[PDB]
Structure 1
Amino acid sequence: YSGRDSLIFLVDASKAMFESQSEDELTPFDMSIQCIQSVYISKIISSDRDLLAVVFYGTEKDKNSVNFKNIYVLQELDNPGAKRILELDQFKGQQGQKRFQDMMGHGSDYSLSEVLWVCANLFSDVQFKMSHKRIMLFTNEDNPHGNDSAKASRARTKAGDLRDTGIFLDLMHLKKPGGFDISLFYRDIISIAEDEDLRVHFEESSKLEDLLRKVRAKETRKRALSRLKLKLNKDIVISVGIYNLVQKALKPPPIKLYRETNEPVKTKTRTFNTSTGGLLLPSDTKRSQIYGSRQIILEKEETEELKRFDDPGLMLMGFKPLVLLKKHHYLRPSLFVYPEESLVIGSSTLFSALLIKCLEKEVAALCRYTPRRNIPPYFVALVPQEEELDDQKIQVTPPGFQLVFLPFADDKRKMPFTEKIMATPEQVGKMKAIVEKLRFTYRSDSFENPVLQQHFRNLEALALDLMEPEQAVDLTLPKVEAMNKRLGSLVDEFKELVYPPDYNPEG
């Protein structure tokens, strides 16, 4: 998967789309606008390098390269930004609907062939490589052309041509007074006709709920940190790739701006002599360190050369039982090692054999690891990792090796000596009861970083000039009320059984 994903939001501008079934309900047009805005915000937060477009059909005015009738391309394929969101915001309400009607109009005819032609033309203009081509149809008219059959045939032919080109088509059908029926006309235009998507739907599509669900977490495409060589010995070498399945998420780096006109500035660092005033490059100056009441002077090149031990890669040392590995010896986040057949042919077979035998014998490969040049070596353990799938066969644990760093003698710290006091069985039983009362299931994606979420919310509020920032609920805060209700009296019994009458833990 290489390139960018392009999406086009086709929104019908027919009269039937501007009628609300109930007074306290959202019109289909407003729902489509809200979905587009949500997708825009999600793309800005997650993938800012993607391309989006917004096109309307069935209007009175037109704006397109080919100069068709009743097709107004509101926004062409361009990276998302706050300006487009603000522009779309002027159609959200009823006054926005009036503004949209005045600007473009509604109630005119249209031909789906022209719409698809305009979409294809928009796709062709983009110069960047596009991994995905996608179009979404926000409409509530299952029979766009019932009076004319030639128009339907032309639309079918254009949809087929687009499908052959490699353009995905999706139908976000909206509520209809009568009921949407895909079988009428949209069975062929839509790229994939699901078996369940054949009955008459009396409610908006379920995909709108997914679209409205804002995702405020960055998405990174698969990439290899390094492509190194595993050396069983001097003459047996295979090629492996290293990946970081877990990586800390950081706020985007701040940028320095000028106060007067918000124009970015450039920061430069320089070093000058005090007694002469001249400028010194980072080669005239030396390095120093005061040991034993004396000064030791080393050049920069020598200082860098102090760290040269061995060439980059992994060197095999032996195999160790997994029992000897310790959980509390954590030093650094682990990495993932996978075969890489491009550099060396035959690496995959040996890697698979090693993984199978390591799983069978429950052993881990001890290795010496050197990520880059002029970096001191470390001792790592490659633990086999089998392929684990979930109920729906979606892979949850890939096959390969888990690279875990092992601490040196300097990475451990001595602990103060503390006398051991053992609790009586009754206290342990009461604590067991409390623990059982406070039991819950844990998942790796059950928590979110409050700082990053609040930062994203504040940034969006500032960019869109919203009245107040949206407040993010913190799921990491203990539920004091629920815990108190569940525990009941157990806390009092434990405190009576473990603490003297006058202890005052807080004090």
Structure 2
Amino acid sequence: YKYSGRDSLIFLVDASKAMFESQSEDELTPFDMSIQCIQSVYISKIISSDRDLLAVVFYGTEKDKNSVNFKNIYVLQELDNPGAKRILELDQFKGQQGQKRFQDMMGHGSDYSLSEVLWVCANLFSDVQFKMSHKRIMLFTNEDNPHGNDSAKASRARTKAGDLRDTGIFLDLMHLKKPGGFDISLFYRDIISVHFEESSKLEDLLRKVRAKETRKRALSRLKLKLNKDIVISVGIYNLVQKALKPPPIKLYRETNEPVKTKTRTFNTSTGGLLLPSDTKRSQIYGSRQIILEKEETEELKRFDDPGLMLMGFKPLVLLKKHHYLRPSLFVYPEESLVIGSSTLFSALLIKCLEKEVAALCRYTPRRNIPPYFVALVPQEEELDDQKIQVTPPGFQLVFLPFADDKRKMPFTEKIMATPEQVGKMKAIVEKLRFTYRSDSFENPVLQQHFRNLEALALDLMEPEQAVDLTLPKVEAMNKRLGSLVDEFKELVYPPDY
């Protein structure tokens, strides 16, 4: 879908006693399972996408809250952006005492009707003003025949859920270990888009996974001036960009209210609230003072207008991988401007890969920025993983240093090791061989930070303290490697350290 549309998601639990207070074991509880799910996807969505909408609803309860079509349904929460007080409302109903806390309020086991329940949720999504990209309902019921004993009750539901799917709201399901069996082919076969224990999907809602997730958006758009005249529009996209702990919002102590940092500039002698025109900019050199205006400290540092000018072609081997400037950015075509320029770009991509070549360019991302120099290395897609595109096809902008960047480094000379000293090393290295994958690690600080932040947010008992994956697991490095550190200590240097 288009950029702005929120994900929006409504959670809809069976309040019926026959599942709600029920267990075959003692070790879980289907309502305590669903409520855990709702709290846990919701705490995922809080860290990861505060912009996307959640609601939660109980059907078949005995005391009601709805706009209309009231009987035996209670909207615990209408659609809203997610936060702490909503997670505290769900927390109240959890656990062995929780399954009594709920009973003092909304009441349990009464008759219900899916064609009314699906009506209610529909009205909910309608009532909200925002643009929605995905509209999804989640069923937390075990009741595999949903009391369609009256087939002329049940045909209402099936038609109404035809009407859900027809209006482009989706609906989705989880089965919840009903004693002895559950089978979708009896009923729910036509409500969703051979026999089950409990859903292999449901564990994915307990991943508790944390990052920002920020959708595909351009960094900027530019014209690749091949010369004085021929241009194509290309996008500039950010495939790799270091995340930061979110900017902290300064607060008033006594009320927790936000407060305005309200900076001014004041003459050291006198009451002049000096305006931006009152003051210049300056330097000191050679015991004299150089004076420039607030226009020209940024008229200096201009050279060009926003574009990419072609500088001719190179071998890919001469672009030496030791000197690297800043993270590489992707280039991909954009018919939003310069229509049909995709036809040129695609031929340019295809044929550079045959030539074993890069294009060299001068790059300005904005007006009032100096040109850097950038090699456009061409790119090719590994769809072989059943069209999981690990690599999009296009170009990489790889940046190149200038003289000033390549800092001087001290004198040293040696070519010291013998073939035995390499030969022992060639063993330890081959014993320590694993497979790195790009996603195999996580930031120890930024992951810890969210766990501290949750403890403070919910008033939990404890910070979760989940230990990081960057420390070497040194006992495994002792054992897999084995004792071979002694080959350095014996064969390579004296015993004095």
Name the TM-score class by shorter chain. Answer: over 0.9
Shift of 1:22: 4.0
User: Are the counterparts in 1 of residues 7 and 133 from structure 2 also a CA contact under 8 Å?
Assistant: yes
Task: Summarize the Cα distance change of 1:390–1:472 in structure 2 as closer, same or farther, 3 Å threshold.
Answer: farther
Shift of 1:208: 1.2
Shift of 1:279: 1.1
Shift of 1:365: 0.7
Counterparts of 1:156 and 1:348, CA distance in 2: 46
Q: Specify the SS of the correspondent of 1:120.
A: helix
1:178-197 matches, cutoff 5 A:
178-191=180-193
User: Are the counterparts in 2 of residues 450 and 472 from structure 1 also a CA contact under 8 Å?
Assistant: no
Counterparts of 2:16 and 2:378, CA distance in 1: 59
Corresponding position of 1:251:
245
Corresponding position of 1:126:
128
Shift of 1:165: 0.4
Counterparts of 1:117 and 1:354, CA distance in 2: 54
Shift of 1:207: 1.5
Task: Summarize the Cα distance change of 1:2–1:254 in structure 2 as closer, same or farther, 3 Å threshold.
Answer: closer
Shift of 1:273: 1.2
Q: State the identity %.
A: 100
Deviations 1:3-23 (A, max 9, x none): 101111010011221244345
User: Are the counterparts in 2 of residues 64 and 72 from structure 1 also a CA contact under 8 Å?
Assistant: yes
User: Does residue 3 of the first structure (1) align with residue 5 of the second (2)?
Assistant: yes
Shift of 1:448: 0.3
Corresponding position of 2:325:
331
Corresponding position of 2:213:
219
Shift of 1:91: 1.1
Shift of 1:490: 1.1
Counterparts of 1:202 and 1:250, CA distance in 2: 43
Shift of 1:392: 2.0
1:105-504 matches, cutoff 5 A:
105-191=107-193, 201-503=195-497
Shift of 1:271: 1.3
Task: Summarize the Cα distance change of 1:312–1:361 in structure 2 as closer, same or farther, 3 Å threshold.
Answer: same
Counterparts of 2:384 and 2:167, CA distance in 1: 34
Shifted more, 226-235 versus 15-24: the winner is 15-24
User: Are the counterparts in 1 of residues 23 and 30 from structure 2 also a CA contact under 8 Å?
Assistant: no
Deviations 1:97-134 (A, max 9, x none): 10112210111011100000001000100100011100
Deviations 1:52-74 (A, max 9, x none): 11011111111000041001111
Deviations 1:387-417 (A, max 9, x none): 2224221111001010011000000111111
User: Are the counterparts in 2 of residues 20 and 26 from structure 1 also a CA contact under 8 Å?
Assistant: no
User: Are the counterparts in 1 of residues 69 and 120 from structure 2 also a CA contact under 8 Å?
Assistant: no
User: Are the counterparts in 1 of residues 24 and 179 from structure 2 also a CA contact under 8 Å?
Assistant: no
Structure richer in helix, relative to its length: 1
Unmatched runs of 5 consecutive residues or more in structure 1:
192-199
State the number of aligned residues.
495
Q: Specify the SS of the correspondent of 2:331.
A: strand
Counterparts of 1:21 and 1:275, CA distance in 2: 79
Shift of 1:146: 3.6
User: Are the counterparts in 1 of residues 377 and 395 from structure 2 also a CA contact under 8 Å?
Assistant: yes
Q: Specify the SS of the correspondent of 1:241.
A: strand
Deviations 1:236-267 (A, max 9, x none): 00000000100010001011111111111101
Q: Specify the SS of the correspondent of 2:269.
A: coil
Counterparts of 1:149 and 1:67, CA distance in 2: 20
Task: Summarize the Cα distance change of 1:83–1:390 in structure 2 as closer, same or farther, 3 Å threshold.
Answer: farther
Shifted more, 138-147 versus 444-453: the winner is 138-147
Counterparts of 2:289 and 2:116, CA distance in 1: 81
Shift of 1:222: 0.7
User: Are the counterparts in 1 of residues 428 and 484 from structure 2 also a CA contact under 8 Å?
Assistant: yes
- TM norm structure 2: 0.98
Counterparts of 2:134 and 2:71, CA distance in 1: 28
User: Are the counterparts in 2 of residues 310 and 377 from structure 1 also a CA contact under 8 Å?
Assistant: yes
User: Are the counterparts in 2 of residues 364 and 384 from structure 1 also a CA contact under 8 Å?
Assistant: yes
Q: List, as ranges, runs of 4+ consecutive aligned residues in structure 1 with deviation greater than 3 Å.
A: 19-24
Shift of 1:83: 0.5
User: Are the counterparts in 2 of residues 311 and 370 from structure 1 also a CA contact under 8 Å?
Assistant: yes
Task: Summarize the Cα distance change of 1:219–1:170 in structure 2 as closer, same or farther, 3 Å threshold.
Answer: same
Corresponding position of 1:194:
none
Counterparts of 1:238 and 1:463, CA distance in 2: 50
User: Are the counterparts in 2 of residues 246 and 333 from structure 1 also a CA contact under 8 Å?
Assistant: yes
Unmatched runs of 5 consecutive residues or more in structure 2:
none
Counterparts of 1:68 and 1:290, CA distance in 2: 77
Counterparts of 1:139 and 1:247, CA distance in 2: 41
Shift of 1:422: 2.1
User: Are the counterparts in 1 of residues 69 and 116 from structure 2 also a CA contact under 8 Å?
Assistant: no
Counterparts of 2:295 and 2:149, CA distance in 1: 82
User: Are the counterparts in 2 of residues 91 and 97 from structure 1 also a CA contact under 8 Å?
Assistant: yes
Counterparts of 2:195 and 2:486, CA distance in 1: 56
Counterparts of 1:390 and 1:40, CA distance in 2: 35
Counterparts of 1:57 and 1:501, CA distance in 2: 76
